[PDB]
Design a protein around this ligand. Sequence first.
Ligand code: GNP
Ligand code: GNP
Ligand code: MG
Ligand code: MG
Lengths: 123, 128, 180, 170
Amino acid sequence: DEVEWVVESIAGFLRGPDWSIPILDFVEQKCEVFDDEEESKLTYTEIHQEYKELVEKLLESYLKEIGINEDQFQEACTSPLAKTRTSQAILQPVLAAEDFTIFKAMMVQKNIEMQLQAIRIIQ
Amino acid sequence: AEEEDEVEWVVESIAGFLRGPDWSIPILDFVEQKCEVFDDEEESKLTYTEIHQEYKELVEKLLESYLKEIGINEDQFQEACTSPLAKTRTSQAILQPVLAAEDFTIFKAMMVQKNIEMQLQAIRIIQE
Amino acid sequence: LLSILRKLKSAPQEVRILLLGLDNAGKTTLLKQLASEDISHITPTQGFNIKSVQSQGFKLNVWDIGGQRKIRPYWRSYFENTDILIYVIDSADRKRFEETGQELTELLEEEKLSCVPVLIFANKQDLLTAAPASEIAEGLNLHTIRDRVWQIQSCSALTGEGVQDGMNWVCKNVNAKKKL
Amino acid sequence: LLSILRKLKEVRILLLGLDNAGKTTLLKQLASEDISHITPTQGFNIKSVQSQGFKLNVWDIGGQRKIRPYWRSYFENTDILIYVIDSADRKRFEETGQELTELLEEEKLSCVPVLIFANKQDLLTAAPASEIAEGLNLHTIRDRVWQIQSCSALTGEGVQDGMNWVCKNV
Ligand SMILES: Nc1nc2c(ncn2[C@@H]2O[C@H](COP(=O)(O)OP(=O)(O)NP(=O)(O)O)[C@@H](O)[C@H]2O)c(=O)[nH]1
Ligand SMILES: Nc1nc2c(ncn2[C@@H]2O[C@H](COP(=O)(O)OP(=O)(O)NP(=O)(O)O)[C@@H](O)[C@H]2O)c(=O)[nH]1
Ligand SMILES: [Mg+2]
Ligand SMILES: [Mg+2]
């Protein structure tokens, strides 16, 4: 079954640095404007659109580099193996591309963390 | 209606504490120091439970120190945590390490996520 | 490709609702009511709020966008992937009926919102001055709406009256857009 | 106080039994997940299942002897006990009976309802549902509601049967 390999290929990508480092760099660079408040700012949506383009470029490059066509990708993402071979932690920046609520939580949390670390350093 | 109002103040006070450095930095230290053993896998190790017990003790300690210094008794603290305001005056991000004290599933997720992040930084550093 | 990614979701059960209308119509108050949350410190919305509500088998993700004129050019950033439109009117504010009718008309002509079901909440019916839903619907020529299902529902976001009646209609039409 | 914190937030189910009893297999059945890649549990699994309008938080702890002294660490806040026996492995009936006895005298498990799964009934080596009951002296228990349910985690037989008992007793 070729779908099982594609699922694991995708999971390996999402665990790897080709994906994880550009994602980390975007989140660290852009999260400072994400206040931990219920109401969201109009700028959050523009930044989310930038995040989408990044995620799409990253996935598109990977698929073409490895030799996986879009429908194989859809088949694998639709398989129940996708959810069992990939953890929720690894899926989170993926799901953030589609789900703004997941995106905002990710940015808010990193913003809280970076501020905490700044405090600890001068303390 | 007045001790209703006072309970609202206690809710706000707790939220303030949970955003502040006296709570947040020891929580941050603990998470960063103890996460290395937390693998991103479905099966949990016995050592996760032991580490959770340590986390529970830290959380209890931080909260008791806060309640004592500010002067808030446990009944009041209980009233504030039961209030619906507790969920809406404190963000999900701020509440997470608190809920992690009783909920191991949240705790593991917190620890697993931090380990992933630290392993990633260790890998990037490896050669620039 | 980005739409394929939603299949990675637990139960892709999820409904995206866009909540629009003029400033002061009652959108944020309605949202907080839907979420069973305190409404005591609501202020004019400078950006947007999102609240997720579990109701009758669906996770309804309700997007509450600020209605001040300066924010309306941003409304269109929220059109894509809308399953349901909820449009809120201050029934007591008759001086603004023309302005709100023009916003609704533009929304109903918008390509990115084509075939989307629309619920019109005639809000603030707790006020004695509130115009009846019947009068509002007549004023907005709602009967002329084509190429989508629609509903108008009298409510008060402040008391909660009529809100669940509107949301029951929403839940029956979660798929009206796709089946169309 | 930690117990006060839980009001800022539900049934906890403890799944014990000897190694190779089929505990994890049963759990993945309960969670409707693939079975084919189950290995001996060196620690523990948790999975939450939605049934009967309940949230079932099921803790599957490894049953190897080296893990059993850790069992005590999962006793707190238990609502239901599910005990699994390999019904084909008669030579371990004494061993599993002694663990079950120690469990049933445990303070932290004072009055918890217990379901006993007579697992692996698909195989006809398996002893009748309750050739096993006694030999285990289950009719002698006295401060606790209990049950024994013949079942089969491979294929699914009787699992739902027992799961219905588990939760009329919540
Ligand atoms: N009498 C009455 N007042 C209401 C009702 N709904 C909202 N209001 C009041 O009308 C005002 C506007 O409410 P709000 O929810 O902020 O409106 P909004 O549509 O979100 N405004 P904006 O788009 O600028 O953020 C508030 O004073 C609110 O309490 C209602 O059903 N009845
Ligand atoms: N015939 C049969 N085999 C079963 C049944 N349940 C499990 N098995 C098999 O017995 C073995 C052990 O199952 P497992 O669920 O791992 O047992 P466990 O109780 O979790 N073991 P441990 O506690 O060491 O992790 C596996 O090879 C499994 O396929 C059953 O009902 N019938
Ligand atoms: Mg508003
Ligand atoms: Mg096992």
